[PDB]
Amino acid sequence: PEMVRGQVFDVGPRYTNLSYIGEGAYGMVCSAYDNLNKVRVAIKKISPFEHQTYCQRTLREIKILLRFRHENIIGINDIIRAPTIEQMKDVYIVQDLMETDLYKLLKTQHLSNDHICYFLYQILRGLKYIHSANVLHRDLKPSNLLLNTTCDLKICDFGLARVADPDHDHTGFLTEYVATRWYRAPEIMLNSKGYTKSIDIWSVGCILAEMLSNRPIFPGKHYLDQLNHILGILGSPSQEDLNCIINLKARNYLLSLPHKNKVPWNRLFPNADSKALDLLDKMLTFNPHKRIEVEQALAHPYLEQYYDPSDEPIAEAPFKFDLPKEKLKELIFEETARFQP
Numbered sequence: 219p220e221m222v223r224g225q226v227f228d229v230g231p232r233y234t235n236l237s238y239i240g241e242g243a244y245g246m247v248c249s250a251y252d253n254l255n256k257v258r259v260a261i262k263k264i265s266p267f268e269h270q271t272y273c274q275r276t277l278r279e280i281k282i283l284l285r286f287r288h289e290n291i292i293g294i295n296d297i298i299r300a301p302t303i304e305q306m307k308d309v310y311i312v313q314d315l316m317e318t319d320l321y322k323l324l325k326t327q328h329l330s331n332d333h334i335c336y337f338l339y340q341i342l343r344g345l346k347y348i349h350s351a352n353v354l355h356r357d358l359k360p361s362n363l364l365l366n367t368t369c370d371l372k373i374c375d376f377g378l379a380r381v382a383d384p385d386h387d388h389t390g391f392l393t394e395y396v397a398t399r400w401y402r403a404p405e406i407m408l409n410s411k412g413y414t415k416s417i418d419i420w421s422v423g424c425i426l427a428e429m430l431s432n433r434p435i436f437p438g439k440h441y442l443d444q445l446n447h448i449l450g451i452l453g454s455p456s457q458e459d460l461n462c463i464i465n466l467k468a469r470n471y472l473l474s475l476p477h478k479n480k481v482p483w484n485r486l487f488p489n490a491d492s493k494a495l496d497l498l499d500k501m502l503t504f505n506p507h508k509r510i511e512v513e514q515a516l517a518h519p520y521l522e523q524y525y526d527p528s529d530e531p532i533a534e535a536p537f538k539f540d541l542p543k544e545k546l547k548e549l550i551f552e553e554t555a556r557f558q559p
């Protein structure tokens with residue numbers, strides 16, 4: 219088998235002329251030439267079978283991406299693995315080759331307002347479809363937003379996704395490890411398991427802020443720091459918003475803090491479009507029940523040049539609703555059979 223960086227990257231003969239791209243959350247990512255479609259593609263090598271949690275996340279990603287079909291969500295074009303469960307050690311996921319991602323782009327490129335608007339529209343368009351499937355992405359962040367050379371944007375990595383479960387969202391204070399720290403909504407640290415759609419909107423708000431300045435808006439240095447950053451900008455929650463938190467440990471923590479004034483968005487972002495800042499404010503709303511939902515965000519005046527609900531499709535088949543790694547390997551093997559061979 220062809221090799222890259224000293225490890226097996228076994229994708230031939232259909233895929234040749236491999237180039238190392240990077241180390242992902244799952245393993246090695248390479249580009250390759252697709253001798254059938256006559257185009258270069260991305261290939262991700264995944265080696266999950268020793269660990270139940272890796273098997274979980276891999277099965278999640280495959281099951282969701284195979285059912286979804288949307289312009290702003292990365293597809294799976296092919297899946298390579300051994301013909302038998304016994305011989306299956308790795309799984310390769312073949313996807314459209316994308317020039318960059320928003321994390322890499324923000325490291326060196328200033329975005330025009332037109333690009334910010336276009337990117338945000340595409341994020342919300344993809345998110346509308348995800349949420350219409352009753353699915354939460356739960357790890358939206360710049361590095362999970364792929365971009366091709368013409369700035370078409372695709373949401374990727376559904377390994378942490380879940381079916382929404384609002385009736386079971388409540389929990390205690392300082393539990394819960396949802397999303398990537400900087401993109402984590404304030405209620406995750408207070409009383410939420412991140413089982414409602416508002417968790418994703420918070421992350422999109424954080425992404426919008428980061429597009430406006432090329433800096434993360436809430437750069438918490440560790441888990442506990444993250445709420446400090448959020449409150450340092452939003453200021454102290456109102457009595458009404460505190461009255462919505464019944465958990466006493468969470469509420470009394472907030473009551474124990476000195477008063478903090480809100481920092482006006484236009485002082486943080488003096489060059490930003492005022493309509494973008496109005497939408498930003500509605501996505502970065504402290505109370506998740508008052509936070510804007512994805513279809514309202516699409517209809518916001520900032521996005522008026524793109525908004526078209528008839529061209530913002532929803533899922534045909536929402537997802538309606540412990541396993542040892544052996545059963546998970548068998549499930550991964552079954553889920554990938556359609557690509558044999």
Ligand SMILES: [N-]=[N+]=NC[C@H]1O[C@@H](n2c(SCCC(=O)O)nc3c(N)ncnc32)[C@H](O)[C@@H]1O
Pocket residue numbers: 239240241242243244247260262313314315316317318319361362364374375
């Ligand atoms: N990651 N990583 N590894 C490093 C490189 O992986 C690049 N990348 C991924 S990564 C998917 C998410 C993950 O697997 O974490 N998908 C693609 C892709 N379809 N086309 C081009 N490049 C891709 C990413 O920009 C990063 O530069």
